[PDB]
Scaffold this active site. Structure first.
Site, short mmCIF file in Angstrom:
data_model
loop_
_atom_site.label_atom_id
_atom_site.label_comp_id
_atom_site.label_asym_id
_atom_site.label_seq_id
_atom_site.Cartn_x
_atom_site.Cartn_y
_atom_site.Cartn_z
CB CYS A 36 -43.26 58.05 -16.28
SG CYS A 36 -42.27 58.28 -17.73
NE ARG B 158 -47.25 57.62 -17.10
CZ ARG B 158 -48.31 57.70 -16.29
NH1 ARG B 158 -49.13 56.65 -16.17
NH2 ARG B 158 -48.56 58.79 -15.58
CD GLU C 191 -35.87 64.13 -16.32
OE1 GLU C 191 -35.55 63.11 -15.62
OE2 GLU C 191 -36.12 64.10 -17.57
CD1 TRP D 9 -36.53 62.01 -24.58
CD2 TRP D 9 -36.28 60.05 -25.65
NE1 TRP D 9 -37.68 61.77 -25.29
CE2 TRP D 9 -37.55 60.59 -25.96
CE3 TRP D 9 -35.89 58.84 -26.24
CZ2 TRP D 9 -38.45 59.94 -26.83
CZ3 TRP D 9 -36.79 58.18 -27.10
CH2 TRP D 9 -38.06 58.74 -27.38
C1 HEM Z 1 -38.67 58.34 -23.22
C2 HEM Z 1 -38.31 59.38 -22.47
C3 HEM Z 1 -38.78 59.55 -21.00
C4 HEM Z 1 -39.05 60.70 -20.40
C5 HEM Z 1 -38.97 62.11 -21.03
C6 HEM Z 1 -39.45 60.40 -19.04
C7 HEM Z 1 -39.80 61.35 -18.11
C8 HEM Z 1 -39.83 61.23 -16.75
C9 HEM Z 1 -39.67 62.28 -15.76
C10 HEM Z 1 -39.38 63.78 -16.04
C11 HEM Z 1 -39.83 61.73 -14.55
C12 HEM Z 1 -39.72 62.45 -13.19
C13 HEM Z 1 -38.37 62.07 -12.57
C14 HEM Z 1 -37.75 63.15 -11.75
O1 HEM Z 1 -38.27 64.29 -11.74
O2 HEM Z 1 -36.72 62.85 -11.10
C15 HEM Z 1 -40.10 60.31 -14.73
C16 HEM Z 1 -40.32 59.38 -13.74
C17 HEM Z 1 -40.44 58.03 -13.97
N1 HEM Z 1 -40.18 57.43 -15.20
FE1 HEM Z 1 -40.07 58.28 -17.17
N2 HEM Z 1 -39.42 59.04 -18.86
C18 HEM Z 1 -39.02 58.49 -20.04
C19 HEM Z 1 -38.81 57.15 -20.26
C20 HEM Z 1 -39.04 56.22 -19.29
C21 HEM Z 1 -38.79 54.80 -19.37
C22 HEM Z 1 -38.17 54.03 -20.56
C23 HEM Z 1 -39.18 54.27 -18.20
C24 HEM Z 1 -39.10 52.79 -17.78
C25 HEM Z 1 -39.29 51.79 -18.65
C26 HEM Z 1 -39.68 55.33 -17.36
C27 HEM Z 1 -40.20 55.17 -16.12
C28 HEM Z 1 -40.36 56.07 -15.12
C29 HEM Z 1 -40.79 55.73 -13.78
C30 HEM Z 1 -41.15 54.35 -13.20
C31 HEM Z 1 -40.84 57.02 -13.01
C32 HEM Z 1 -41.24 57.12 -11.53
C33 HEM Z 1 -40.00 57.21 -10.64
C34 HEM Z 1 -40.44 57.43 -9.19
O3 HEM Z 1 -41.45 56.81 -8.74
O4 HEM Z 1 -39.77 58.24 -8.46
N3 HEM Z 1 -39.59 56.51 -18.06
N4 HEM Z 1 -40.08 60.04 -16.09
C1 LIG Z 2 -35.83 56.69 -17.68
C2 LIG Z 2 -35.74 58.13 -17.24
C3 LIG Z 2 -35.97 59.16 -18.14
C4 LIG Z 2 -35.86 60.48 -17.69
N1 LIG Z 2 -36.07 61.50 -18.57
N2 LIG Z 2 -35.55 60.76 -16.38
C5 LIG Z 2 -35.35 59.76 -15.48
C6 LIG Z 2 -35.05 60.06 -14.01
C7 LIG Z 2 -36.19 59.48 -13.13
C8 LIG Z 2 -35.77 59.19 -11.69
C9 LIG Z 2 -34.78 60.01 -11.14
C10 LIG Z 2 -34.30 59.84 -9.83
C11 LIG Z 2 -34.83 58.82 -9.05
C12 LIG Z 2 -35.84 57.97 -9.56
C13 LIG Z 2 -36.33 56.92 -8.59
C14 LIG Z 2 -36.47 57.56 -7.19
C15 LIG Z 2 -35.94 56.74 -6.02
C16 LIG Z 2 -35.78 55.35 -6.09
C17 LIG Z 2 -35.31 54.62 -5.00
C18 LIG Z 2 -35.15 53.12 -5.08
N3 LIG Z 2 -34.98 55.27 -3.85
C19 LIG Z 2 -35.12 56.62 -3.75
N4 LIG Z 2 -34.78 57.20 -2.56
C20 LIG Z 2 -35.60 57.38 -4.82
C21 LIG Z 2 -36.32 58.15 -10.88
C22 LIG Z 2 -35.43 58.42 -15.91
#
Ligand code: HEM
Ligand SMILES: Cc1cc(N)nc(CCc2cccc(CCc3cc(C)nc(N)c3)c2)c1
Ligand code: HEM
Ligand SMILES: Cc1cc(N)nc(CCc2cccc(CCc3cc(C)nc(N)c3)c2)c1
Ligand SMILES: C[C@H](O)[C@H](O)[C@H]1CNc2nc(N)[nH]c(=O)c2N1
Ligand SMILES: C[C@H](O)[C@H](O)[C@H]1CNc2nc(N)[nH]c(=O)c2N1
Ligand SMILES: [Zn+2]
Lengths: 406, 405
Positions: A110, A113, A287, A282
């Site tokens: 993420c 953060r 994305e 947000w």
């Molecule tokens: C506040 C605005 C936020 C932004 C801009 C942001 C940004 C991002 C982005 C760009 C990704 C990559 C996802 C992708 O490419 O599909 C990501 C992944 C992730 N985000 Fe954030 N996030 C935000 C808020 C949050 C919040 C509130 C949470 C949870 C409380 C969170 C938790 C996560 C987690 C756990 C991942 C990893 C997902 C994975 O393992 O595939 N984010 N985030």
């Molecule tokens: C809170 C938040 C903010 C933001 N800007 N973008 C996102 C999207 C992040 C995001 C997008 C696709 C998928 C995941 C989890 C990936 C994932 C999770 C599981 C359970 N199985 C899979 N095959 C893949 C996380 C989330």
């Protein structure tokens, strides 16, 4: 130096050592023989649960500065007695709030953060039907959407129980466009969502025929078939996409929704597992503008757009893919700004992640980060993160991937 | 045991079995991944001998004579030499095999589809820094070929336990001076400040442009290094112009034709080659994106964007991304105009994808470093971004080595 990873920023020549990684209690996928750092996914009883619980409770009391105290040892005692008799235990309200934020803080992938400390935690550990799940989710969407002034939130449903079904949300995100498999092999809508679309229709959803048909929710209470819920349209805020100067772009009929709300992740806190804890923040513009619209296996719109741009797509060296992608990304930002809906471009987001890295260095002595994921899918080295070495490792609390419920 | 490798664009799956032949530990452990780190922070007869056995084995297999007389007898020769002298020497064809394999095994190289097409100059009969310079000039002339670049390596004498190494002090054969100015500024290439000062301290008269081709500091064992100026006519350069923006040319930007790394150690069957310069051709992002737009290199992005009259006040106007593309376009156009080999990052990665395929059939996998293979603009617009990758260390290999100073 010390025997911890030395970490260099090559833009600025600065060095840090990561001491936080020593806290890691779980192995990832790498070994000295080979690095698996780029794989997207790689692969409770008493002993195991208790020490995980102990660890977390320590974490909690550390964070409120009461480590070693009477209230700390009694809570420890309260926990191990509860595990002694029921086999599980429950978190106090403020423990959940702490652990949920900590899970967001600990998430390597993420970039967002800097905001970890500011999260609205909705306790829904009293939820007892799929209907009630719907209500909760609707409130979550209303709150978080705040008519465009997006606010981070998480809604925590009840935890996995010993031989008892899970609370699950079938949809990978709260808002998703349909993906309909055509007769000509192709896909109308989002190809990412073919399976869930097909699951929805099988559970009685009357389908649409558009590229941006909002999916219904399939929500599952323990031991029950999943029930189907349509989100009222007034609740699902969307943004039609236009370009600041390319006038024809509004005519493509492209759009995206405002609230990025992931719903299929497991939230683990001191060994307790919350299989349904959807959270939302947000968008970062890349994305939508790069991954969702341009991936060959999503909307795949790059050729369409470059043609309108009158670029030479017959050859690679005209950089037509690059030109169009930039314009599509800028259309995402322009349209989100215009609609007054929170968005952050990949430059601001990455700069703010550098500040987060500096804070965490001061606070915990390191920050787990997945370089391949943190660095944006356009304009990579144009952003400062590209030049920052990162250490990756699993801290807990955490969000995990989990199997699909079907 | 065997990692499942997946391509997310196409849903296809492979299994890397090659990584089992890795003999050399990288930086990761199960507790934490260090794959984004740029660098990692007589070998007892037993070890040299076994690395050598393994190399010879690879070689006789490569020529399908694995287990024949010539195979056994060459193992005899190596056993005899190590036993007597604590080291041994390579036959030219083996050296030729080794080099290509070191290229093949380079996880951070996107150009490996070309790995079999490599001209190998044996310079192992080099006894002076003067002689090194002659070899270096032949290599340049060969490799440049009037703009129709041809991949090449020149291999100087191996290391030897008694004595100092043969070394090229420059990190590439062609480099632009970086001059530190009084006002904390740098004129020229900031990556080469150190090496410029070294040249100056060894008696080079410095120019003061933004593009002063540096001299080679070349070092023979346990002797001071020597200064040699490359004849300006061996150094092919390409002035930068832009297909549509007339003003771009006025920037006076330029880059050289030949990317020729000269500070990497080449290891083959346990022998080490401390000077073994190699060259291929450029991929445009190296010049267009990194060399010219890196904030800590030439850092031209703001300048360009102002020329383009873009809103520089804010990040959301995407002035950096817009200027960056124009610069990569200027680079491709200019090379194509000057009839000098260059590959754009789309063509390169598409071909690397194919190389991943050939290697799969051939060897059961391909060591690859995702962070280096994905280009520095438009990552996900390239097929390599959606391709999972297993990274590990095969031998023959190029390694980094300390700076000779
Ligand atoms: C506040 C605005 C936020 C932004 C801009 C942001 C940004 C991002 C982005 C760009 C990704 C990559 C996802 C992708 O490419 O599909 C990501 C992944 C992730 N985000 Fe954030 N996030 C935000 C808020 C949050 C919040 C509130 C949470 C949870 C409380 C969170 C938790 C996560 C987690 C756990 C991942 C990893 C997902 C994975 O393992 O595939 N984010 N985030
Ligand atoms: C809170 C938040 C903010 C933001 N800007 N973008 C996102 C999207 C992040 C995001 C997008 C696709 C998928 C995941 C989890 C990936 C994932 C999770 C599981 C359970 N199985 C899979 N095959 C893949 C996380 C989330
Ligand atoms: C023929 C055309 C070639 C192309 C287009 C190419 C492309 C590249 C690129 C873009 C990189 C990353 C460069 C950087 O960011 O600094 C790289 C790395 C590398 N290349 Fe190639 N290359 C080519 C030929 C060769 C040759 C001939 C050799 C040696 C025989 C070679 C050996 C290597 C090695 C060892 C690395 C790793 C550098 C490191 O670990 O720091 N390449 N290549
Ligand atoms: C054959 C070839 C082709 C091409 N297109 N580009 C190149 C340039 C790549 C390149 C440039 C400088 C240096 C290296 C490796 C040596 C190297 C050594 C150290 C210590 N740090 C580094 N960042 C790099 C590689 C080489
Ligand atoms: C193979 C590779 O791990 C995969 O394509 C990753 C690369 N980096 C990413 N980074 C982000 N933020 N999101 C992603 O989906 C991906 N995809
Ligand atoms: C720290 C990070 O690993 C570093 O910036 C890497 C990233 N990827 C790269 N990729 C290439 N081709 N060349 C590089 O110098 C780098 N730098
Ligand atoms: Zn790793």
């Amino acid at each position: 130096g010390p025997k911890f990873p030395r970490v260099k920023n090559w833009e600025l020549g600065s060095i840090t050592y990561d001491t936080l990684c020593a806290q890691s209690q779980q192995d990832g996928p790498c070994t000295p023989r080979r690095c698996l750092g780029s794989l997207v996914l790689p692969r409770p009883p008493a002993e195991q649960l208790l020490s995980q619980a102990r660890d977390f409770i320590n974490q909690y009391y550390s964070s409120i500065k009461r480590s070693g105290s009477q209230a700390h040892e009694e809570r420890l005692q309260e926990v191990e007695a509860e595990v002694a008799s029921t086999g599980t235990y429950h978190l106090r309200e403020s423990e959940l709030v702490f652990g949920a934020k900590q899970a967001w803080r600990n998430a390597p992938r993420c970039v967002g953060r800097i905001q970890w400390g500011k999260l609205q935690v909705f306790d829904a550990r009293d939820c007892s039907s799929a209907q009630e799940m719907f209500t909760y989710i609707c409130n979550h969407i209303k709150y978080a959407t705040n008519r465009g002034n997006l606010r981070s939130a998480i809604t925590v449903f009840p935890q996995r129980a010993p031989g008892r079904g899970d609370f699950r949300i079938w949809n990978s995100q709260l808002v998703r466009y349909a993906g309909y498999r055509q007769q000509d092999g192709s896909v109308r809508g989002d190809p990412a969502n073919v399976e869930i679309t097909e699951l929805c229709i099988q559970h009685g959803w009357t389908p649409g025929n558009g590229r941006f048909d909002v999916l219904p929710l399939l929500l599952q209470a323990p031991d029950e078939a999943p029930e189907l819920f349509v989100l009222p349209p007034e609740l699902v805020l969307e943004v039609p996409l236009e370009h600041p100067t390319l006038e024809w772009f509004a005519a493509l009929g492209l759009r995206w929704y405002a609230l990025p709300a992931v719903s299929n992740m497991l939230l683990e806190i001191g060994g307790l597992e919350f299989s349904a804890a959807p959270f939302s923040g947000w968008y970062m513009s890349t994305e939508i503008g790069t991954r969702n619209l341009c991936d060959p296996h999503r909307y795949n719109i790059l050729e369409d757009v470059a043609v309108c741009m009158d670029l030479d797509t017959r050859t690679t060296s005209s950089l037509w893919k690059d030109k169009a992608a930039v314009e599509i990304n800028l259309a995402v930002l322009h349209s989100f700004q215009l609609a007054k809906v929170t968005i952050v471009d990949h430059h601001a987001a990455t700069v703010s992640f550098m500040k987060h890295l500096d804070n965490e260095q001061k606070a915990r002595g390191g920050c787990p980060a997945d370089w391949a994921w943190i660095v944006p899918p356009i304009s990579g080295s144009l952003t400062p993160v590209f030049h920052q070495e990162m250490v990756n490792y699993i801290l807990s609390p955490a969000f995990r991937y989990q199997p699909d419920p079907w």
